[PDB]
């Protein structure tokens, strides 16, 4: 069921992968908001280049 990570299940691994999930989740949100900032600047650049 779904894409496994083929990891060895133990409590240290659960904690490690929970922290890894938290890191990847905050990274997704952070890069998404960086992308919105850059695409805002990019749309400004596009309208100025059309002008």
């Amino acid at each position: 069921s779904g894409n496994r990570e083929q990891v060895f299940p133990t409590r240290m691994t659960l904690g490690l992968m929970k922290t890894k999930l938290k890191g990847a989740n905050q990274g997704y949100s952070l890069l998404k908001r960086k992308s919105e900032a850059l695409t805002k600047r990019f749309r400004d650049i596009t309208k100025r280049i059309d002008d």
Binding site: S1, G2, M17, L21, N25, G27, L31, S35, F42
Partner: protein, 51 residues
């Protein structure tokens, strides 16, 4: 900025599609399936001892 926005947008998309959605099943396995199963086995052994 077009190249940078493409790279950042595809990184965020790759995160939300592959990375987070493979880390989540990894933890789902590690706790819900395996750790619960192992606790269940240990409780079976303890109940046999009690019997």
């Amino acid at each position: 900025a077009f190249i940078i926005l493409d790279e950042v947008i595809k990184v965020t998309n790759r995160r939300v599609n592959a990375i987070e959605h493979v880390i989540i099943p990894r933890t789902e396995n590690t706790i819900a399936y395996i750790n619960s199963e192992l606790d269940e086995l240990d409780r079976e052994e303890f109940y046999r001892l009690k019997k």
